[PDB]
Amino acid sequence: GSHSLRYFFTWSTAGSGIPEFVAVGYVDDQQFVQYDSDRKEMIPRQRWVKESEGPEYWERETQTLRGWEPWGKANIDILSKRTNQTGGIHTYQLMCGCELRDDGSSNTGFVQHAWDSTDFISLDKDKMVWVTPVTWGEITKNKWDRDMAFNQGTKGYLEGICIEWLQKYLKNGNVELRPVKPSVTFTSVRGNKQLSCVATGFYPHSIEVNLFRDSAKIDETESTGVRPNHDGSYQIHRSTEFDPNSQAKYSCVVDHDGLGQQLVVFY
Amino acid sequence: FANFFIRGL
Amino acid sequence: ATSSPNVQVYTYKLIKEGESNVLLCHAKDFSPPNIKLELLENGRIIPNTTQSDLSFESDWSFKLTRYVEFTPQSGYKYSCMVTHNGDSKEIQLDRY
């Protein structure tokens, strides 16, 4: 099994509703930590991490994010000047993380930055050079390519620190991080007009669900796509057009790595 | 464990 | 770049009248994150809701979810009022 530890940072312009800075941490598909510019502390979103991490962990994680908080705000002003934008609603985003592989394989890592939800700058870990598809990133790229300690440090995090803690998290959140199978329903709905296959309560989000008419695969099928529930699990509805009197047998087939064997359900 | 390597733009 | 939200409103399990369920309103594929989600029961705001922490996909587009534990009654109509940027739209609960 592949596993990941990823962080998502969002800086928003001082404005309505949303805190000026919000960061979230994920092990695989499960959110486990949160920080925002109102509370100004890194807090658990999972019990396993709350139980297994002492005062020093939360103290340090809070301090780290406190450094990130002003940084991104400064960024929004810097990039507005660079793009000659002067006001309005603006965003900075940062994505970084690592992936651990047992099947194979070479470990991966990434750090990606975005300005107003468009590619700003990111690191090529293999070449150890920063890439930018825009002119307003070039001046940052030239500074960041020079900065050895920054570059090697970031690389050390993605390849070393990130992987190491991910491994600790996988041990400490072991049962909590296990896949949970979908509970699936296959029933006539909307006054017997449509036949709907609904899978709910599954984790992680990734899922295959296909409909079959009398051993044949059904195209022209309607799907909500995977969407979150309230408890860290996910759901999906796939439905097709129907007749209640018809002779042909209908089946719904589900693939989820919480199943470990293909699951079929008949009408 | 959050990344802590921060450098100005 | 700005994109308007794709909004879905749905329940955790199959609705049965008098069965305690969860009402969800999920917004995706939107930017900027200046957005508000308000769950409604007959056009009136449901109190005590929970909203997920702001997060985003690889394409930088944002995603948010607001939910309540609730009991669907026979007569009652449910929706979600979404305000993104200066635009406000209301999505009704699609029932089966």
Side-chain angles (χ1 to χ4, degrees):
Chain A
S2 171
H3 296 289
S4 69
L5 169 62
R6 304 166 305 162
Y7 284 87
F8 301 78
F9 301 71
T10 304
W11 294 267
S12 296
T13 191
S16 280
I18 284 305
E20 297 183 59
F21 181 45
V22 46
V24 288
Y26 285 87
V27 177
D28 296 318
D29 277 2
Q30 170 177 297
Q31 200 201 320
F32 77 110
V33 290
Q34 186 273 348
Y35 178 101
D36 66 69
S37 46
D38 296 328
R39 203 207 166 111
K40 303 193 203 291
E41 291 174 324
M42 182 74 103
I43 63 166
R45 283 303 191 215
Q46 285 297 323
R47 182 158 146 269
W48 66 262
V49 72
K50 190 212 275 261
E51 281 166 343
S52 63
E53 291 302 347
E56 279 183 23
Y57 178 95
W58 300 104
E59 285 151 17
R60 180 207 48 251
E61 294 308 286
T62 291
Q63 179 65 56
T64 298
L65 269 289
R66 276 163 184 201
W68 283 112
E69 181 183 334
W71 180 78
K73 192 154 104 161
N75 284 187
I76 73 162
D77 288 86
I78 293 165
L79 291 178
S80 292
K81 191 175 178 186
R82 286 194 193 166
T83 49
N84 290 304
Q85 305 222 43
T86 189
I89 298 149
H90 299 290
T91 299
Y92 199 89
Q93 288 165 284
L94 200 188
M95 263 173 74
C96 56
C98 57
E99 178 174 74
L100 179 75
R101 300 191 185 165
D102 46 24
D103 297 297
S105 192
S106 203
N107 283 171
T108 71
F110 67 92
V111 54
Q112 296 158 226
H113 304 237
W115 158 248
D116 281 352
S117 297
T118 59
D119 283 15
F120 171 58
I121 202 167
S122 57
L123 168 73
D124 185 327
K125 200 181 74 171
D126 301 349
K127 295 284 185 187
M128 280 311 298
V129 74
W130 295 90
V131 307
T132 174
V134 289
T135 61
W136 50 91
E138 288 178 19
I139 187 72
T140 294
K141 172 187 160 55
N142 290 170
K143 290 166 81 171
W144 283 16
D145 286 332
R146 260 62 178 243
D147 205 325
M148 179 91 77
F150 179 61
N151 288 336
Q152 283 304 301
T154 302
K155 186 198 184 84
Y157 170 81
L158 296 179
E159 289 176 0
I161 290 154
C162 184
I163 292 295
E164 182 184 11
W165 285 83
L166 175 58
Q167 274 163 354
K168 186 197 187 183
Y169 295 151
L170 289 164
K171 169 206 156 197
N172 286 153
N174 182 216
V175 64
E176 295 81 9
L177 289 157
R178 289 211 262 254
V180 45
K181 70 186 166 80
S183 80
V184 312
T185 282
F186 202 27
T187 52
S188 73
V189 291
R190 299 183 196 274
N192 294 253
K193 179 168 165 280
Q194 307 206 45
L195 212 70
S196 195
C197 197
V198 41
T200 197
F202 58 87
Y203 171 95
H205 84 100
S206 198
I207 196 167
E208 299 283 292
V209 39
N210 297 285
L211 273 67
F212 284 83
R213 182 174 179 269
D214 204 45
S215 291
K217 166 77 154 64
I218 304 174
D219 292 79
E220 194 182 346
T221 181
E222 200 133 30
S223 177
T224 58
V226 58
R227 54 192 186 187
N229 286 135
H230 69 304
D231 57 1
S233 72
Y234 303 85
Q235 66 165 72
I236 185 166
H237 294 240
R238 194 180 289 284
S239 57
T240 195
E241 287 280 28
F242 187 50
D243 273 316
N245 41 55
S246 64
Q247 316 289 76
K249 303 287 167 181
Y250 290 104
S251 64
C252 178
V253 69
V254 185
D255 278 282
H256 181 88
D257 64 21
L259 294 163
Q261 204 75 51
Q262 214 170 242
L263 178 134
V264 282
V265 44
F266 304 105
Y267 170 72
Chain B
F1 195 107
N3 185 11
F4 56 97
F5 297 97
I6 305 163
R7 216 56 173 122
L9 296 192
Chain C
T2 71
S3 173
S4 290
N6 185 289
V7 180
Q8 289 172 278
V9 305
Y10 52 100
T11 62
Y12 166 68
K13 201 182 158 190
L14 178 76
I15 295 168
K16 297 174 70 188
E17 322 297 349
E19 188 72 40
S20 53
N21 212 300
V22 182
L23 180 69
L24 310 105
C25 177
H26 177 75
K28 68 180 189 192
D29 302 319
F30 66 97
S31 54
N34 61 326
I35 193 171
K36 185 162 77 176
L37 317 183
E38 299 174 307
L39 291 178
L40 307 175
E41 193 191 71
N42 309 144
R44 263 156 63 39
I45 297 168
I46 307 166
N48 324 121
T49 66
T50 311
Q51 175 165 272
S52 65
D53 305 313
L54 187 67
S55 188
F56 57 88
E57 303 287 348
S58 316
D59 66 3
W60 309 107
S61 70
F62 296 91
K63 54 178 172 154
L64 255 194
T65 319
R66 186 177 293 283
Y67 64 87
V68 293
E69 295 84 349
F70 86 124
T71 306
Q73 314 281 81
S74 302
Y76 283 123
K77 143 261 182 182
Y78 304 90
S79 62
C80 182
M81 180 67 81
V82 181
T83 310
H84 180 54
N85 260 6
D87 188 72
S88 319
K89 232 187 226 177
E90 181 180 334
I91 311 292
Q92 241 63 35
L93 170 72
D94 194 354
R95 209 178 292 196
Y96 271 9

